[PDB]
């Protein structure tokens, strides 16, 4: 089973950011949905969750800009925030949450949980209570119970994360160029120069190529634009024989382009 995030990859400062999340293998009356985020270099921050019942809880120090909504006919939960800033540039995760509040019925030191017959109890009704000292009896004075609350919480499964860049810049598409070439191997590549923002998809022959495709992390050119490379280790004699094409998909610019790595 799995979760699937979706939403903008770029948002201008001070705008409202809107993300959505769908379920597969389960739906929105079986678990609770939570939203986590991480700004790289920083720790994980809790945002808020909405449970099977439908009410919401949030992060106190961050709730002033938050909202969670739900619609289980689409199997959808929507997260949203206002006055977005660049501190919030981060990966936003849709999470399967398990949570429940629980009480403890404690008596003061000089008292215990029992029925009038003296037998231990451990409930909160039918004539059982905190009774005093040496006693067994029906009219034996009772006294105020002490109630402790413990809170359960844990995430049993994670989405794959949605990367959000907050910037006042356009979704410039990449310029994609081919990189032509003691062990019998050869190197093919595709240079994906200046673009903005992350991410980028790089398949090879539309996924036909798997073993060998070492795709690399991008850099941040001092210009403010990203650029990366994707290299493939191939056998040297298959060149020319096998036409190799890299399929680069930058979706924020709505551009997918393919290039041959020509000899």
């Amino acid at each position: 089973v799995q979760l699937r995030e979706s939403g903008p990859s770029l948002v201008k400062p001070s705008q409202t950011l809107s993300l959505t999340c769908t379920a597969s293998g389960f739906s929105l009356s079986d678990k609770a949905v939570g939203w986590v985020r991480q700004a790289p270099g920083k720790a994980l921050e809790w945002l808020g969750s909405i449970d099977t019942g439908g009410n919401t809880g949030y992060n106190p120090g961050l709730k002033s800009r938050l909202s969670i909504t739900k619609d289980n006919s689409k199997s959808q939960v929507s997260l949203s925030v206002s006055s977005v800033t660049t501190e919030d540039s981060a990966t936003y995760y849709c999470t399967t949450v398990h949570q429940r509040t629980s009480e403890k019925r404690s008596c003061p030191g000089g008292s215990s949980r029992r029925y009038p017959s003296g037998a231990s109890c451990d409930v909160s009704g039918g004539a059982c209570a905190c009774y005093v000292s040496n006693c067994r009896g029906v009219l034996c004075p009772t006294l105020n119970e002490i109630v402790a609350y413990t809170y359960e919480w844990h995430v049993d499964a994670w989405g794959q994360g949605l990367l959000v860049t907050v910037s006042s810049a356009s979704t410039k598409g990449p310029s994609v160029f081919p990189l032509a070439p003691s062990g019998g191997t050869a190197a093919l590549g595709c240079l994906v120069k200046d673009y903005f923002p992350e991410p980028v998809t790089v398949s090879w022959n539309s996924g036909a190529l798997t073993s060998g495709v070492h795709t690399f992390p991008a850099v941040l050119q001092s210009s403010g634009l990203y650029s990366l490379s994707s290299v493939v280790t191939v056998p040297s004699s298959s060149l020319g024989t096998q036409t190799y094409i890299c399929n680069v998909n930058h979706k924020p610019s709505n551009t997918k382009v393919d290039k041959k790595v020509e000899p």
Partner: protein
């Protein structure tokens, strides 16, 4: 928020543990949970409920707690266990979770693999765009400690260089890249462009040259 250590280290096959120090209203309740962040992957759910393993979790791990401090315990360290680790629990409400500052694991004792360098000249098409970008790619090295230099005709080059910071591969070794951006009037003028890589004192380099 929770006071984790910045980093921790152990050895392959050995034992190591992380501490997570909070307060009475958040960790004192118990029901603490631990998660594993292997970079480039969505995190794992390690522990939930002070000690209970999540579905599909290996038993190499186990939780522990004393009062306001939780402990994550592992032995038989694997290379795939290098990652960040985050504790968390609820504070005053079942719908308000707090994480810790995060702790990075170093699994000492892995093979100090030497880097494998590949170097690409600016592509002809890129030059048709009147731009040049030399591409130096580095695979299969450990640890993630490396320094890159560029030499034009055996002389050091300062301007035009941008270098990644390393990242994990599938086999828990590291990989990185470096780009030397040039004007074609510079690239056409020189005879050697060399990418030199320093890894734990060892040097591995490649060199390209312009042709027609």
């Amino acid at each position: 928020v929770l006071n984790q250590p910045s980093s921790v280290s152990g050895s392959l096959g050995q034992r190591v543990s992380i501490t997570c120090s909070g307060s009475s209203s958040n960790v004192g309740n118990g029901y603490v949970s631990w998660y594993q962040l292997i970079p480039g992957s969505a995190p794992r759910t390690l522990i939930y409920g002070d000690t209970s393993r999540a579905s599909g979790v290996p038993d190499r791990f186990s939780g522990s707690r004393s009062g306001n401090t939780a402990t994550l315990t592992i032995s038989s360290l694997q290379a795939e266990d290098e990652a960040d680790y985050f504790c968390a629990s609820a504070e005053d409400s079942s719908s308000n979770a707090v994480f810790g500052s995060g702790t990075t694991l170093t699994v000492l004792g892995q093979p100090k693999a030497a880097p494998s360098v590949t170097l690409f000249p600016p592509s002809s098409e890129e030059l048709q765009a009147n731009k040049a970008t030399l591409v130096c790619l580095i695979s299969d090295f450990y640890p993630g400690a490396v320094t890159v230099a560029w030499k034009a005709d055996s002389s050091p080059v300062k301007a035009g260089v941008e270098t990644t910071t390393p990242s994990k591969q599938s086999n828990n070794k590291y990989a990185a890249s470096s780009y030397l951006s040039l004007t074609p009037e510079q690239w056409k003028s020189h005879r050697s462009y060399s990418c030199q890589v320093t890894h734990e004192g060892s040097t591995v380099e490649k060199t390209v040259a312009p042709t027609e």
